[PDB]
From a paper:
In stark contrast, WT-CI, prepared by the same method, is observed predominantly in the A state, with a 30-min, substrate-free incubation at 37 ˚C in vitro required for deactivation. The ND6-P25L-CI and WT-D structures match very closely overall (RMSD value 0.59 Å) and reveal only subtle structural differences in the vicinity of the mutation itself. First, in WT-CI, the A and D complexes differ globally through the relative arrangement of their hydrophilic and membrane domains. When the π-bulge is formed the upper (matrix) part of TMH3 rotates, relaxing the helical turn; conversely, destruction of the π-bulge during activation tightens the helical turn. Notably, the upper part of TMH3 contains two bulky aromatic residues, Phe67 and Tyr69, which adopt different rotational positions in the two states. Crucially, Phe67 transits through the TMH3–TMH2 interface, from one side to the other, as the upper part of TMH3 rotates. Steric hindrance to the rotation, from these and other residues, likely explains why deactivation is so slow in the WT enzyme. As a result, the ND3-TMH1–2 loop that carries Cys39 is no longer anchored and becomes disordered, exposing the Cys to derivatization and NDUFS2 and NDUFS7 loops in the CoQ-binding site to the matrix. The resulting loss of structural integrity in the CoQ-binding site explains why the D state is catalytically inactive.
Residue numbers in the entry:
A (entry chain N): 1 to 344
B (entry chain K): 1 to 98
C (entry chain J): 1 to 171
D (entry chain Z): 48 to 143
E (entry chain A): 1 to 25, 51 to 115
F (entry chain e): 1 to 104
G (entry chain a): 1 to 68
H (entry chain X): 1 to 114
Write the structure that this text describes.
Amino acid sequence: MNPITLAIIYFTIFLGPVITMSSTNLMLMWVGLEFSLLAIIPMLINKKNPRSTEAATKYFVTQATASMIILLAIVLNYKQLGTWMFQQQTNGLILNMTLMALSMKLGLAPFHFWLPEVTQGIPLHMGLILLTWQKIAPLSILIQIYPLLNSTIILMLAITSIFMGAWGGLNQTQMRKIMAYSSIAHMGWMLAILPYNPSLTLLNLMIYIILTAPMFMALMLNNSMTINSISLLWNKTPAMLTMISLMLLSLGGLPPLTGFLPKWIIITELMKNNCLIMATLMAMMALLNLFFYTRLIYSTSLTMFPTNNNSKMMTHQTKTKPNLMFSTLAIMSTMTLPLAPQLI
Amino acid sequence: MPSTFFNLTMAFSLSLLGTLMFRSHLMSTLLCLEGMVLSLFIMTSVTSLNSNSMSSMPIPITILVFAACEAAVGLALLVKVSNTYGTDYVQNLNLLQC
Amino acid sequence: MNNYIFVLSSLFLVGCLGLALKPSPIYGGLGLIVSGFVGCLMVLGFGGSFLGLMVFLIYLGGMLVVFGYTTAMATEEYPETWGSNWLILGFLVLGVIMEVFLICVLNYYDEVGVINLDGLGDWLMYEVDDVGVMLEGGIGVAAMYSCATWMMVVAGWSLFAGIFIIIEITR
Amino acid sequence: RMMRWNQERRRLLIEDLEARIALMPLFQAEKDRRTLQILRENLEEEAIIMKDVPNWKVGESVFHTTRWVPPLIGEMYGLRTKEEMSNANFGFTWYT
Amino acid sequence: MNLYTVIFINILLSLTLILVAFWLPFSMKFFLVAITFLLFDLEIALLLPLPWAIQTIKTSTMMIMAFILVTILSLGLAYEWTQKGLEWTE
Amino acid sequence: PFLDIQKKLGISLDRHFMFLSAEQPYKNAARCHAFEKEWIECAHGIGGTRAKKECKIEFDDFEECLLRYKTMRRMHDIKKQREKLMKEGKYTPPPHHSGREEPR
Amino acid sequence: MWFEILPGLAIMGVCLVIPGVSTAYIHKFTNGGKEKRVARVQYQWYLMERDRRISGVNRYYVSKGLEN
Amino acid sequence: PGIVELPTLEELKVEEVKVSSAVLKAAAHHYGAQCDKTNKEFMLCRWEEKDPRRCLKEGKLVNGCALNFFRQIKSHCAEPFTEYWTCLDYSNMQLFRHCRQQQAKFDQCVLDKL
Amino acid sequence: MFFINILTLLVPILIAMAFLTLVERKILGYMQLRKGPNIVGPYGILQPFADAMKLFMKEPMRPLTTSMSLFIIAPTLSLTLALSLWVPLPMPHPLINLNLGILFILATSSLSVYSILWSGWASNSKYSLFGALRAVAQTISYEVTMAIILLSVLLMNGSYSLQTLITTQEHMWLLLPAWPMAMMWFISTLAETNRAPFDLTEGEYAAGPFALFFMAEYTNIILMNALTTIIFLGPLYYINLPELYSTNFMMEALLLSSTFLWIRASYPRFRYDQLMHLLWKNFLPLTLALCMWHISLPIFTAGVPPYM
Amino acid sequence: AGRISAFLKNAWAKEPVLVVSFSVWGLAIIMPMISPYTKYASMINKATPYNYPVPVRDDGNMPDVPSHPQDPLGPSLDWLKNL
Ligand SMILES: CCCCCCCCCCCCCCCCCC(=O)OC[C@H](COP(=O)(O)OCCN)OC(=O)CCCCCCCCCCCCCCCCC
Ligand SMILES: CCCCCCCCCCCCCCCCCC(=O)OC[C@H](COP(=O)(O)OCCN)OC(=O)CCCCCCCCCCCCCCCCC
């Protein structure tokens, strides 16, 4: 891949969500989504192996069906009201079809089965984008219509997502599938709080992004796509444990760490709205995410696993990978609770 | 108008049903997707012509362009799948389950 | 001729049904071609000369063509599909009859609602300027060049970048 | 030569459109009278067609606006002949 | 009605002739070609409304946009050319 | 929208051809221009919660002029009664409805 | 010599001339000695329907003039 | 709700022109100068007051002042006009490009006798 | 009267194709220093009827591994399109006066790829499929210029109608301007009709189907040359002399259809790769350049045409 | 000058088609700024009356608008004829 191709594809990847967020016309939003899809597929398939091809095929089919359903919703609203924007008068079925489509675009349960497979078949720098930058346009389209949504189906989707994310991460031994299920869970939290306050959806979005980017960078440091491969980190690069552990605990949502605040304030709002039963279920089932993050903190930072020999030569060699953003984002994501009133 | 729109929506629903129900091929899914595209194109053009809103005619053109691009990339992916396995079958994409 | 557009929409329905049922990637192409022909015909019935002829010249002449092309060059017909083809043809018959009964029940349940069979030939054209020039569809599709240049740049960029995308996917 | 020819063509087009302009008023008045008479006929018929029905106001608008609402060709040629309806809808799109 | 009559007549004549006839006694190059043709046919779709666009007042704008279309199409062609997409030498 | 960069730079890429009351090329009017104009002008400045209830007569008028369900139902009732009367022999159509008159 | 292809060239030429003049004559016959009026827009269709309505014999080509 | 209001049949009843398109087109450029005021008044009524039922008093005057024009034309200078519109009605788009000299005849005749 | 008009349109074009066969044979013979047909009838005017009888009297050996559906609807489609193309043609008045008529021509011409491809996919082989793919690619590629040329030349007459070109050339042919667009249009008619030097698809059907394919081919030939005459060689149109217009149109169309055979006898064939290079490296650049030129010409000249 | 001119002659010999394409591109983008007859296009396409000129009320203060088509107070496109 040459510079011109790289520039065009990445400019499209960047432009998609920007059009989606800067356009008032649902047609232009749909355009942005299509841009994102078109420009993401090639990067997934770069390696040209069976797994990457399969992941690309699955992604394409799912996202294309979703886009078609969204465009049907738009066309129906157009026949109904003459305008190209959802108002307070659209048949709720239109908006529920739209929500189903956006949920399949994001990766929410029970529309999630494609996300772990794709992320696994895909490399690291691509999972990073797929799980951080490709959540911003479909969430924006929802933030624009939060007053006219169905709390019932939203909460069902969110709680299903929490549950399935926990019960997947409990079993997966692969970094990328673990990240996929964590994404599912946090997006469930977002959807849950959406129709009551979207500022908190955006808060949790930025928190999850700041928490995910540096984790994928940590992994890419040694291309450790597995638990038994990341356990050798104590001999390969032990100056990263003090931060991997803290970022994983923050993801889990442990009180003294940034990652807590999202759950805390979202539960607060749900209580103000009398969604206490759902808030309780979610808060109790996030502890499994915390569990299978602690199980990794163990194998990485609190106990040394059987190492290898050529790791000696790996020690001999130097390295210049981890740019400043790693430290910056990890600190901002682990030590920023005293500033919660501002982030709110 | 009501009748033709009802039938167009039923047709879109049938093509979505076809997509969500695979029958061992992949072309037979891309074709259902294109049928959906066609139904939406027709509904949009028909609403434009019914309302006499000439400020909304570019919309079919745009969606046709983008559906064409989607179909092109889908056909390329199908071509790679065939080049590797030998068939546009869906039981051969059983990887990533581990 | 009151039944004209209704017949056209019903043929479109049957074509999309023969798509939903998946005989093969080639008879599916033929079904798509028929459905598109009928779609153009109904657009012209509603007055979309440019839209319908563009469908003709681009969707069929450009899209279904490469569909069949890629199909022939990258697909093989297996002998099993013939018995199942007959089976799904019977399935299609059953679906047609089920749809007829569906339409009957919907007329019984909503006279002036879902479909006004009594007012079939009506409610096709609601209004039109009788003494008016400059009200075709090209006048609108050509707005793009003066107003709505944003759509034109969007589409041109999609097509532009598709070149790089496809060369990188195939390579 | 093509420039010098298409400019004269433009002048001729302007002439024809000016004729159209000069004519239009006559046509608009004739059309208004025609459609008003159509609606009046349909009303004078509905009056006796729907006398024995319960709670049917003869000439009941479907609007709360009180202003003029151009009628649909369905409203006009609904009680008239199906060939009239077909000439209204598929009459210009059918090559003279 | 007239178009319908003419096309029906032609179809009938063809089928009649073909009945009398019986009753008297993988390379990616072609795919890339198809794709290029798609990307140019859609350009034709975006280019056809010029006879109606050149009747407007925003001539300085139609000039611009049509030139943009043609120029970036030529650039995409040139790139597909440089990258050996029009060669056929397997 | 979600990011009002358009309104920031005071431009219009997509927000001038949204609805029917907008500008059409050769001043060609759309069907429900007046109804939609009135609905918008009356809902301007009180957005949303209010306009869904205290700007509802105009939305009903727009809905009727665009979808015409009530007009359809009226004409259908008329034609049904007329068919029943013709069948039972208590009414005959006039000439101009039958297909012959003196036109204008 | 080269002047033996004419027996066929002229046949084809006659067969290619027939359509045009045939259509013209048939138009002049079916439309009252006048060309077949074309309708590229709704204005011309309105003029045509109006002539038809004022004819009194339901034919757009029966021009009436001042006498009426 | 609301009883629609329409006018009776006795009214909107007037002596139409019953003249054909070629004729109106051959007489337009003069009918656009003569008989212009009572046409602009009506095309102002019909646009200010969006209802046609409020401009019948003006449409009748339109018809009357058009009949007066076509009656002046018959009284004086009928034959050039007759041949001019007979030549016009031959074409399909009813074009002014072919009948240019008969038009000059009509124009000279009307300019001399009026 | 309309059915009579349809007969008057269809019968003569079929006769003209049947005799264009003979004209081709005789011209090629005299260019090869021989006569051609002389015997069956005076100067050969019975040979086409003889050949038709022979073919339709043969016995069809329908490939066993095939599909009757695609075997029958391919030539049916070909002939249907080849006949329905002749409908809108102004000669000078058209049987069906359409706006967007040249677009109808484009589409009903581009629809033949389906038959030229279904025939191959039906014939159960790999060589026939190779040939079909290649011919489809050729036809497709040249459709692009076939479309852009018209897209650029229809700005001297601002309408997609064929009855406007008469008045557009009421004073001068559209050849003097756009003679570089014609030279590229006159050729895409050869490659589109698989006509030499672009006959890489005929250089596998029963009697009747082969005959229908032949009919379609030569009908399309005559029609492409007729389009050339109407567009770039606008004949005379005196409102009272459709006879004159038709005479001149016939003469020019015969000139062009004889030029095709002149070429067939004069030049060798092409090589598929070089044939595609031709378009994609010589015709498309010049076509886009002249398209921009013809978009600018009506502007920096005040000669922008009308929309009637 | 010499090197680039030799390059251009090499091209003019080898690939005249590319040279002609690029030069026509340049002519297209350049001539519309040289020409004086450009403005007249917008002028005409504005002057074309595809709609009815809805009149206005004579409210007294409007001296530069006529009361009859044949008055010289309004626009007059004799420049089109003179063109
Ligand atoms: C005040 C309010 C309280 C609020 C709540 C506070 C939350 C609790 C604070 C938790 C902070 C630590 C949590 C993560 C534990 C990290 C585990 C760890 O790093 O130790 C294991 C590893 C041992 O490496 P090993 O190979 O065995 O030999 C030494 C060679 N370095 O160690 C390493 O290898 C480290 C990498 C070596 C780099 C060179 C040494 C420089 C120092 C790095 C460690 C800095 C730790 C800072 C501790 C501050 C505690 C507040
Ligand atoms: C078993 C063998 C199968 C092979 C079959 C092959 C058949 C293909 C034949 C070629 C297809 C021709 C396509 C026809 C498109 C017509 C486009 C057109 O221009 O018609 C528009 C017509 C005029 O409208 P316009 O020009 O815009 O302005 C008029 C105002 N004065 O306004 C109109 O809309 C006129 C009404 C439309 C008439 C179109 C009918 C076309 C012929 C129908 C073919 C039916 C064949 C059987 C069914 C097909 C399969 C389902």
